[PDB]
Design a protein around this ligand. Structure first.
Ligand SMILES: *[C@@H]1O[C@H](CO)[C@@H](O)[C@H](O)[C@H]1NC(C)=O
Ligand SMILES: *[C@@H]1O[C@H](CO)[C@@H](O)[C@H](O)[C@H]1NC(C)=O
Lengths: 437, 437
């Protein structure tokens, strides 16, 4: 038996779902949302990490003839210097002054821990979210995991469940992002095509396959000083190191809905955005018929205290003439007030205590027993005063009953102020009709 | 030196891109596009393969006590029968009748060549596309490889190029597709949750690691006949084999632009749609300056025969006084007619032959030498009666020129017929100005 329902996509909030298929005993469904996850799609444009400037020893040859060459590995600077007069601890070496040559070369290479100390970039696409849902009812209580996509199936037991599409995807991720050892950032990194020499992405190599190490580190050489042998070069500092030293504002504390983020598959957890639909079908042999426990007759309530707004403050009592005892279900039709207990046993006395909670100062809830329903209002006067850390057990809406028992005088005085004008204008219409003649 | 251009996405079509910066001789670029390849995103919902019905040998026991047990393997048919009188080669076993047990059980499992003979489902989304581009200019002719995404460099050499994003992604794929041994289909599938018993995907297993082989193949058991030992089970044939048998209508023949599909990463190649923008920058020292071979003087063009529309029938003669002979650049400003010759050598005589092509019978292409420009017109009346097997090499725009030579009489007769009524309006105006008085 199919049936549609909607649940606010919030973790740790029990949800009620009563069934009203006549010919059988009415019953209810307990729904629990536990640890939803949202796993985006990744693209892995390029990766970056540290780098070392690899330079070999300089060459000195005592003839003075020039030797120039180039090789295809990236970022070489084929510079040759003459007129060098090098020294060394043996006073000096060779003898031909003003006739000498030095060919100093250098390049860059990725870090020795490029497989471990690397930061990666990624693209963001439309994401899919999983969920773990705990379903319970009469003599059944178990959990399951579903894709909560546009269509899926649970097969939790004799019954079956389906989850509808998500109303809106207010995902924290956007466009392109960066990840670095268990944290992410919404950095607008430069493209693979070009790189600013020093800010970020100094090397723009792809995966560790180790080919085509693009780099814009921009080495610059100079003529060595007359003192002794050197390899003078100017190298901008590692932008990746600077990005480490700055970092700041890790995205984990920037989640709009407090959506904590793990990184091993890159996903998001436990944030309450929108609401989710559900459609269920139930075998008819999953619960007893109407022949068991008809215990309604006349039904009346009594309201005691409504110390509300924290967990449950609406303590109420229900009394009624009862037949032989049995399992009977109860719920509340209005969404203003929510009760906390499912079907409960009934003794022969007829007095049963129930709890609920609501922010409304004058609740007008609609109690329904497994065969009869009645209205019952409470002067929910106690306004609490705390700052509690536990969750709420009510809808965010609040509005006093139009009928009510406190704001009645305001609406009646407004109605009287309007009715005096209405009666007077009726008198005016009658008098003008008489005088028109 | 940044400059922008557009290229139609037609494979095998040389493209001429002219740069006419002052202070240097104008220069021309040859553009080639070789085998584009659009690659989509894949999601891998689940898998589908054959199913084997595994049935153990039946259990016999001559005491009458039944042993019904339930396990966690899929789609058990737990049933045991009584009143069985089995027979074998030795006639029969045991003696008791009307008090016997016959236990029969069966279940389903994935196929043996599941590792190789599987079929894959995938979800498509926004897709990137790579292109191979060959660039040529003066004494430089090399291929490239760019992702032609929103922004990315090429760096073919002294110059640098960046290919812009595609206008619209008219991907042949859509939503959900199926991959099975070198062919795809635009055929939707039931979700991973539930499936129809027999049509397709009656086995909806996840990844090949053989976990939770969900089955809805509807096994049924029956009472064995009184003759001998049996195990009567009824089962619908495998939907995977039936789907292979019917197959038909491969997607490789439904490409809306003749885009051949290769399955190893699943991409679509060699198909024309839209156009590709590009930007570039060129070093100053990549060409010559104006002081080299200025020899335009005056100019005029002639045409001998202009049988057009197939490859190139527009032989044109250009003569002009010449200075010291040398190289130069030549192209056409408009696109009504297109040429094939790149920068060409110039002799002292000045007689130069050109090959061009067009569609309309009255081209108005304006030729342009690297310093001069003169209007060229021709009466390319004669078509040719063939159905060519090779590619077209000109823009599809067919339109007689505003000036023209055959449609002029239409223009003059329309102008004259307008002139009759214009002069009639004039004479009416003079008459009414006389009579207004
Ligand atoms: C359902 O079972 C869980 C343990 O798996 C338990 O904590 C919970 O209280 C049960 N629900 C009810 C309504 O008893
Ligand atoms: C570029 O070089 C290839 C040889 O690999 C040649 O076939 C082609 O014609 C050259 N391009 C031009 C415009 O001549």
């Amino acid at each position: 038996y199919e049936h549609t329902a909607t649940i606010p996509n919030v973790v740790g909030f029990p949800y009620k779902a009563h069934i009203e298929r006549n010919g059988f005993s009415p019953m209810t469904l307990q729904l629990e949302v536990l640890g939803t996850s949202l796993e985006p799609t990744l693209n892995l444009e390029y990766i970056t990490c540290e780098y070392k400037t690899v330079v070999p020893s300089p060459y000195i040859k005592c003839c003075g003839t020039s030797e120039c060459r180039s090789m295809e590995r990236p970022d070489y600077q084929c510079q040759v210097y003459t007129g060098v007069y090098p020294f060394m601890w043996g006073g000096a070496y060779c003898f031909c002054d003003t006739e000498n040559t030095q060919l100093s070369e250098a390049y860059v290479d990725r870090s020795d821990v490029c497989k471990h100390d690397h930061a990666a970039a990624y693209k963001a696409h439309t994401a899919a979210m999983k969920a773990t849902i705990r379903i319970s009812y009469g003599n059944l209580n178990q959990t399951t995991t579903a894709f909560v996509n546009g269509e899926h199936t649970v097969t939790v037991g004799g019954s079956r469940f389906t989850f509808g599409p998500i109303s809106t995807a207010w995902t924290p991720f956007d466009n392109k992002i960066v990840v670095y050892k268990n944290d992410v950032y919404n950095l607008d990194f430069p493209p693979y095509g070009s790189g600013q020499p020093g800010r970020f992405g100094d090397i723009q190599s792809r995966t560790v396959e180790s080919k085509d190490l693009y780099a814009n580190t921009a080495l610059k050489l100079s003529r060595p000083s007359s003192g002794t042998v050197h390899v003078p070069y100017t190298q901008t500092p590692s932008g990746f190191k600077y990005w480490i030293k700055e970092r700041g504002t890790s995205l984990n504390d920037k989640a709009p809905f407090g959506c904590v983020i793990k990184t091993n598959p890159v996903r998001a957890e436990n944030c309450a955005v929108g609401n989710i639909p559900v459609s269920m079908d139930i075998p008819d042999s999953a619960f007893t018929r109407v022949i068991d426990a008809p215990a309604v007759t006349n039904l009346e309530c009594q309201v005691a205290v409504c110390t509300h707004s924290s967990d449950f403050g609406g303590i109420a009592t229900l009394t009624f003439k009862t037949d032989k005892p049995g399992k009977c279900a109860v719920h509340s039709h209005s969404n203003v007030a929510t009760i906390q207990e499912a079907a409960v046993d009934i003794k022969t006395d007829g007095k049963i205590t129930l709890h609920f909670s609501t922010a409304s100062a004058s609740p007008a809830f609609k109690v329904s027993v497994c065969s009869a329903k009645t209205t019952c209002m409470a002067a929910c006067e106690p306004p609490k005063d705390h700052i509690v850390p536990y969750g709420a057990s009510h809808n965010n809406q609040v509005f006093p009953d139009m009928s009510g028992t406190a704001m009645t005088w305001v609406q009646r005085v407004a109605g009287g102020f309007g009715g005096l004008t209405l009666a007077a204008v009726a008198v005016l219409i009658l008098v003008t009709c008489v005088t028109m003649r």
